[PDB]
Coordinates of N, CA, C and O in Angstrom, one line a residue:
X4 N -30.3 -19.1 5.4 CA -29.5 -19.6 6.5 C -28.9 -18.4 7.2 O -28.3 -17.5 6.6
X5 N -29.0 -18.4 8.6 CA -28.5 -17.2 9.3 C -27.0 -17.1 9.3 O -26.5 -16.0 9.2
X6 N -26.3 -18.3 9.3 CA -24.9 -18.3 9.3 C -24.2 -18.1 7.9 O -23.2 -17.4 7.8
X7 N -24.8 -18.6 6.8 CA -24.3 -18.3 5.4 C -24.4 -16.9 5.0 O -23.6 -16.3 4.4
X8 N -25.5 -16.2 5.4 CA -25.7 -14.8 5.2 C -24.8 -13.9 6.1 O -24.4 -12.9 5.6
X9 N -24.6 -14.3 7.3 CA -23.6 -13.6 8.2 C -22.3 -13.6 7.6 O -21.6 -12.5 7.6
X10 N -21.8 -14.7 7.2 CA -20.4 -14.9 6.6 C -20.3 -14.2 5.3 O -19.2 -13.6 5.0
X11 N -21.3 -14.3 4.5 CA -21.3 -13.5 3.2 C -21.1 -12.0 3.4 O -20.3 -11.4 2.8
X12 N -21.9 -11.5 4.4 CA -21.9 -10.1 4.7 C -20.6 -9.6 5.4 O -20.2 -8.5 5.1
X13 N -20.1 -10.5 6.2 CA -18.9 -10.3 7.0 C -17.6 -10.3 6.0 O -16.8 -9.4 6.0
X14 N -17.4 -11.4 5.3 CA -16.1 -11.7 4.6 C -16.1 -11.5 3.1 O -15.0 -11.5 2.5
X15 N -17.2 -11.5 2.4 CA -17.3 -11.5 1.0 C -18.2 -10.4 0.4 O -18.9 -10.6 -0.6
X16 N -18.2 -9.2 1.1 CA -19.1 -8.1 0.7 C -18.4 -6.8 0.9 O -17.8 -6.5 1.9
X17 N -18.3 -6.0 -0.2 CA -17.5 -4.8 -0.1 C -18.3 -3.9 0.9 O -19.5 -3.9 0.9
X18 N -17.6 -3.0 1.6 CA -18.1 -2.1 2.6 C -19.4 -1.3 2.2 O -20.4 -1.4 2.9
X19 N -19.4 -0.6 1.0 CA -20.7 0.0 0.7 C -21.9 -0.9 0.7 O -23.0 -0.5 1.1
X20 N -21.8 -2.1 0.1 CA -22.9 -3.0 0.0 C -23.3 -3.5 1.5 O -24.5 -3.7 1.7
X21 N -22.3 -3.6 2.4 CA -22.5 -4.1 3.8 C -23.3 -2.9 4.5 O -24.3 -3.2 5.2
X22 N -22.9 -1.7 4.2 CA -23.6 -0.5 4.9 C -25.1 -0.4 4.3 O -26.0 0.0 5.1
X23 N -25.3 -0.8 3.1 CA -26.6 -0.7 2.5 C -27.5 -1.8 3.2 O -28.6 -1.5 3.5
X24 N -26.9 -3.0 3.3 CA -27.6 -4.1 4.0 C -28.0 -3.8 5.4 O -29.1 -4.0 5.8
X25 N -27.1 -3.2 6.1 CA -27.3 -2.6 7.4 C -28.4 -1.5 7.5 O -29.3 -1.7 8.4
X26 N -28.3 -0.5 6.7 CA -29.3 0.6 6.6 C -30.7 0.0 6.3 O -31.7 0.5 6.9
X27 N -30.8 -1.0 5.5 CA -32.0 -1.7 5.2 C -32.4 -2.8 6.1 O -33.5 -3.3 6.0
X28 N -31.5 -3.1 7.1 CA -31.7 -4.2 8.0 C -32.0 -5.5 7.2 O -33.0 -6.2 7.5
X29 N -31.2 -5.9 6.2 CA -31.5 -7.0 5.3 C -30.4 -8.0 5.3 O -29.3 -7.7 4.8
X30 N -30.7 -9.3 5.7 CA -32.0 -9.8 6.1 C -32.4 -9.5 7.6 O -31.5 -9.6 8.5
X31 N -33.6 -9.1 7.8 CA -34.2 -8.8 9.1 C -34.0 -9.6 10.3 O -34.1 -9.2 11.5
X32 N -33.7 -10.9 10.1 CA -33.5 -11.9 11.2 C -32.2 -11.8 12.0 O -32.1 -12.4 13.1
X33 N -31.3 -11.0 11.5 CA -30.0 -10.9 12.3 C -29.9 -9.5 13.0 O -30.6 -8.6 12.8
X34 N -28.8 -9.4 13.8 CA -28.6 -8.3 14.7 C -27.9 -7.2 13.9 O -26.7 -7.4 13.5
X35 N -28.5 -6.1 13.7 CA -28.0 -4.9 13.0 C -27.6 -3.7 13.8 O -27.3 -2.6 13.3
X36 N -27.7 -3.9 15.1 CA -27.4 -2.8 16.1 C -25.9 -2.7 16.3 O -25.2 -3.7 16.3
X37 N -25.4 -1.5 16.6 CA -24.0 -1.2 16.9 C -23.8 -0.1 17.9 O -24.7 0.8 18.0
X38 N -22.7 -0.1 18.6 CA -22.2 1.0 19.4 C -21.0 1.6 18.8 O -20.1 2.2 19.5
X39 N -21.0 1.6 17.5 CA -19.8 2.0 16.7 C -18.5 1.4 17.0 O -18.5 0.2 17.3
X40 N -17.4 2.2 17.2 CA -16.2 1.7 17.7 C -16.4 1.7 19.3 O -16.6 2.9 19.8
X41 N -16.5 0.6 19.9 CA -17.2 0.5 21.3 C -16.4 1.3 22.4 O -15.7 0.7 23.2
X42 N -16.7 2.6 22.4 CA -15.7 3.6 22.9 C -14.2 3.4 22.8 O -13.4 2.8 23.6
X43 N -13.8 3.9 21.6 CA -12.5 4.4 21.1 C -13.2 5.3 20.1 O -14.3 5.0 19.6
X44 N -12.7 6.5 19.8 CA -13.4 7.3 18.9 C -13.7 6.6 17.5 O -12.9 5.7 17.1
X45 N -14.8 7.0 16.9 CA -15.3 6.5 15.6 C -14.4 7.1 14.5 O -14.3 6.4 13.5
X46 N -13.8 8.3 14.7 CA -12.9 8.9 13.7 C -11.6 9.3 14.3 O -11.3 10.5 14.5
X47 N -10.7 8.3 14.7 CA -9.4 8.7 15.3 C -8.5 9.5 14.3 O -8.4 9.0 13.2
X48 N -8.0 10.6 14.7 CA -7.2 11.5 13.9 C -8.0 12.0 12.6 O -7.4 12.3 11.6
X49 N -9.3 11.9 12.7 CA -10.2 12.1 11.6 C -10.4 11.1 10.6 O -11.1 11.3 9.5
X50 N -9.9 9.9 10.8 CA -10.1 8.7 9.9 C -11.4 8.0 10.1 O -11.7 7.8 11.3
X51 N -12.1 7.7 9.1 CA -13.4 6.9 9.3 C -13.1 5.4 9.6 O -12.9 4.6 8.7
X52 N -13.2 5.1 10.9 CA -13.0 3.7 11.4 C -14.4 3.2 11.7 O -14.6 2.0 12.0
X53 N -15.4 4.1 11.7 CA -16.8 3.7 12.1 C -17.4 2.6 11.2 O -18.0 1.6 11.7
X54 N -17.2 2.6 9.9 CA -17.8 1.6 9.0 C -17.2 0.2 9.4 O -17.9 -0.8 9.5
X55 N -15.9 0.1 9.6 CA -15.2 -1.1 10.0 C -15.6 -1.6 11.4 O -15.9 -2.8 11.5
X56 N -15.8 -0.7 12.3 CA -16.4 -1.0 13.6 C -17.8 -1.5 13.5 O -18.2 -2.5 14.2
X57 N -18.6 -0.9 12.6 CA -20.0 -1.4 12.4 C -20.0 -2.9 12.0 O -20.8 -3.7 12.5
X58 N -19.1 -3.2 11.1 CA -19.0 -4.5 10.6 C -18.4 -5.5 11.6 O -18.8 -6.6 11.8
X59 N -17.4 -4.9 12.4 CA -16.8 -5.7 13.5 C -17.9 -6.0 14.6 O -17.9 -7.1 15.1
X60 N -18.7 -5.0 14.9 CA -19.9 -5.2 15.9 C -20.9 -6.3 15.3 O -21.4 -7.1 16.1
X61 N -21.2 -6.2 14.0 CA -22.0 -7.2 13.3 C -21.5 -8.6 13.4 O -22.3 -9.5 13.7
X62 N -20.2 -8.7 13.4 CA -19.6 -10.0 13.5 C -19.7 -10.6 14.9 O -20.0 -11.7 15.1
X63 N -19.3 -9.7 15.9 CA -19.4 -10.0 17.3 C -20.8 -10.3 17.8 O -21.1 -11.4 18.3
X64 N -21.8 -9.4 17.6 CA -23.2 -9.5 18.0 C -23.9 -10.7 17.3 O -24.7 -11.4 18.0
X65 N -23.6 -11.0 16.0 CA -24.2 -12.1 15.4 C -23.6 -13.5 15.7 O -24.3 -14.4 15.8
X66 N -22.3 -13.5 15.9 CA -21.7 -14.8 16.3 C -22.1 -15.1 17.8 O -22.2 -16.3 18.0
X67 N -22.3 -14.1 18.6 CA -22.8 -14.3 20.0 C -24.2 -14.8 20.0 O -24.6 -15.7 20.7
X68 N -25.1 -14.1 19.2 CA -26.5 -14.5 19.1 C -26.6 -15.9 18.5 O -27.5 -16.7 18.8
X69 N -25.7 -16.2 17.6 CA -25.5 -17.5 16.9 C -24.8 -18.4 17.9 O -24.4 -18.0 19.0
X70 N -24.4 -19.6 17.5 CA -23.8 -20.6 18.4 C -22.3 -20.5 18.6 O -21.7 -21.3 19.4
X71 N -21.6 -19.6 17.9 CA -20.2 -19.8 17.6 C -19.2 -18.7 18.0 O -18.2 -18.5 17.3
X72 N -19.4 -17.9 19.0 CA -18.4 -16.8 19.4 C -17.2 -17.4 20.2 O -17.0 -17.1 21.3
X73 N -16.5 -18.3 19.5 CA -15.3 -18.9 20.1 C -14.1 -18.0 20.0 O -14.2 -17.0 19.3
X74 N -13.0 -18.3 20.7 CA -11.8 -17.5 20.5 C -11.3 -17.6 19.0 O -10.9 -16.5 18.5
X75 N -11.2 -18.7 18.4 CA -10.8 -18.8 17.0 C -11.7 -18.0 16.0 O -11.2 -17.4 15.1
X76 N -13.0 -18.1 16.2 CA -13.9 -17.2 15.4 C -13.8 -15.8 15.7 O -13.8 -15.0 14.7
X77 N -13.6 -15.4 17.0 CA -13.3 -14.0 17.3 C -12.1 -13.4 16.6 O -12.2 -12.3 16.2
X78 N -11.1 -14.2 16.4 CA -9.8 -13.8 15.7 C -10.1 -13.6 14.2 O -9.5 -12.7 13.6
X79 N -10.9 -14.4 13.6 CA -11.3 -14.3 12.2 C -12.0 -13.0 12.0 O -11.7 -12.3 11.0
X80 N -12.9 -12.7 12.9 CA -13.7 -11.4 12.9 C -12.8 -10.2 13.2 O -12.9 -9.2 12.5
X81 N -11.8 -10.4 14.1 CA -10.8 -9.3 14.3 C -9.9 -9.0 13.1 O -9.6 -7.9 12.8
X82 N -9.5 -10.1 12.5 CA -8.6 -10.0 11.3 C -9.4 -9.3 10.1 O -8.8 -8.5 9.4
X83 N -10.6 -9.6 10.0 CA -11.5 -9.0 9.0 C -11.6 -7.5 9.3 O -11.7 -6.6 8.4
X84 N -11.6 -7.1 10.6 CA -11.6 -5.8 11.0 C -10.3 -5.0 10.6 O -10.4 -3.9 10.0
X85 N -9.1 -5.6 10.8 CA -7.9 -4.9 10.3 C -8.0 -4.8 8.8 O -7.5 -3.8 8.2
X86 N -8.5 -5.8 8.1 CA -8.7 -5.8 6.6 C -9.5 -4.6 6.2 O -9.1 -3.8 5.3
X87 N -10.7 -4.4 6.9 CA -11.6 -3.3 6.6 C -11.0 -2.0 6.9 O -11.1 -1.0 6.1
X88 N -10.2 -1.9 8.0 CA -9.5 -0.7 8.4 C -8.5 -0.3 7.4 O -8.4 0.8 6.9
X89 N -7.7 -1.3 7.0 CA -6.6 -1.1 5.9 C -7.3 -0.7 4.6 O -6.6 0.1 3.8
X90 N -8.5 -1.1 4.3 CA -9.2 -0.7 3.0 C -9.5 0.8 3.1 O -9.3 1.5 2.1
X91 N -9.9 1.2 4.3 CA -10.2 2.6 4.4 C -8.9 3.5 4.3 O -9.0 4.5 3.6
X92 N -7.9 3.1 5.0 CA -6.6 3.8 4.9 C -6.0 3.9 3.5 O -5.5 4.9 3.2
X93 N -6.2 2.8 2.7 CA -5.7 2.8 1.3 C -6.4 3.8 0.4 O -6.1 3.9 -0.8
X94 N -7.4 4.5 0.9 CA -8.2 5.6 0.1 C -7.4 6.9 0.1 O -8.0 7.9 -0.4
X95 N -6.2 6.9 0.7 CA -5.4 8.2 0.7 C -4.3 8.0 -0.3 O -3.4 7.2 -0.2
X96 N -4.4 8.9 -1.3 CA -3.4 9.0 -2.4 C -3.0 10.5 -2.8 O -3.9 11.4 -2.7
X97 N -1.8 10.7 -3.1 CA -0.7 9.8 -3.0 C 0.7 10.4 -3.1 O 1.5 9.8 -3.8
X98 N 1.1 11.5 -2.4 CA 0.3 12.3 -1.3 C -0.4 11.4 -0.2 O -0.4 10.2 -0.2
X99 N -0.9 12.1 0.8 CA -1.3 11.6 2.1 C -0.7 10.2 2.3 O -1.4 9.2 2.5
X100 N 0.6 10.3 2.2 CA 1.7 9.3 2.2 C 1.9 8.5 3.5 O 2.0 7.3 3.4
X101 N 1.9 9.1 4.8 CA 1.3 10.4 5.4 C 0.0 10.0 6.0 O 0.0 9.4 7.0
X102 N -1.1 10.3 5.3 CA -2.4 10.0 5.9 C -2.6 8.4 5.9 O -3.0 7.9 6.9
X103 N -2.2 7.8 4.8 CA -2.3 6.3 4.7 C -1.4 5.6 5.7 O -2.0 4.6 6.4
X104 N -0.2 6.0 5.8 CA 0.7 5.4 6.8 C 0.3 5.8 8.2 O 0.3 4.9 9.1
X105 N -0.2 7.0 8.5 CA -0.7 7.3 9.9 C -2.0 6.5 10.2 O -2.2 6.0 11.3
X106 N -2.9 6.4 9.2 CA -4.1 5.7 9.4 C -3.8 4.2 9.7 O -4.5 3.7 10.6
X107 N -2.9 3.6 9.0 CA -2.5 2.2 9.2 C -1.9 1.9 10.6 O -2.2 0.8 11.2
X108 N -1.1 2.8 11.1 CA -0.5 2.7 12.4 C -1.6 2.7 13.5 O -1.6 1.9 14.4
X109 N -2.6 3.6 13.3 CA -3.7 3.7 14.3 C -4.6 2.5 14.1 O -5.2 1.9 15.1
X110 N -4.8 2.0 12.8 CA -5.6 0.8 12.6 C -4.9 -0.4 13.3 O -5.6 -1.2 13.9
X111 N -3.6 -0.4 13.4 CA -2.9 -1.5 14.1 C -3.2 -1.5 15.6 O -3.4 -2.6 16.2
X112 N -3.3 -0.3 16.2 CA -3.6 -0.1 17.6 C -5.1 -0.5 17.9 O -5.3 -1.1 19.0
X113 N -6.0 -0.1 17.0 CA -7.4 -0.6 17.1 C -7.5 -2.1 17.1 O -8.2 -2.7 17.9
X114 N -6.7 -2.7 16.2 CA -6.7 -4.1 16.0 C -6.1 -4.8 17.3 O -6.7 -5.7 17.8
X115 N -5.0 -4.3 17.7 CA -4.3 -4.8 19.0 C -5.3 -4.8 20.2 O -5.3 -5.8 20.9
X116 N -6.1 -3.7 20.3 CA -7.0 -3.5 21.3 C -8.2 -4.5 21.4 O -8.5 -5.0 22.4
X117 N -8.8 -4.8 20.2 CA -9.8 -5.8 20.0 C -9.2 -7.2 20.3 O -9.9 -7.9 21.1
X118 N -8.0 -7.5 19.9 CA -7.3 -8.8 20.2 C -7.2 -9.0 21.7 O -7.6 -10.1 22.3
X119 N -6.8 -8.0 22.5 CA -6.6 -8.0 23.9 C -8.0 -8.0 24.7 O -8.1 -8.8 25.6
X120 N -8.9 -7.1 24.3 CA -10.1 -6.9 25.2 C -11.4 -7.3 24.7 O -12.4 -7.3 25.5
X121 N -11.5 -7.9 23.5 CA -12.7 -8.2 22.8 C -13.6 -9.3 23.4 O -14.8 -9.3 23.2
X122 N -12.9 -10.2 24.2 CA -13.6 -11.3 24.9 C -14.5 -10.7 26.0 O -15.3 -11.5 26.6
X123 N -14.4 -9.5 26.4 CA -15.3 -8.8 27.3 C -16.5 -8.2 26.5 O -16.5 -7.2 25.7

């Protein structure tokens, strides 16, 4: 099912396994292309936001190719993007008190931006 696999990969798959599925284009039937963070840097202040953007692009591109890119589905995909970004930020310990807090503040800005302009 194109929709059950999209949602599994979007909402119930840890990032490394999502990137593996991406790299292998598996399952082949769906859209695996991306423009990274759709011009906003991929690594703002040197933080890796590209993996989260890749998954956010997966969600947008596949819901559009599918029947369901509504405003309420767009928000579910945007919220999963802040989740993914916060997962990356939480990799700073402990120490980078600092990196984690700065990364989260920029993640909030990236999230705010997709909420506002993502319908384009």
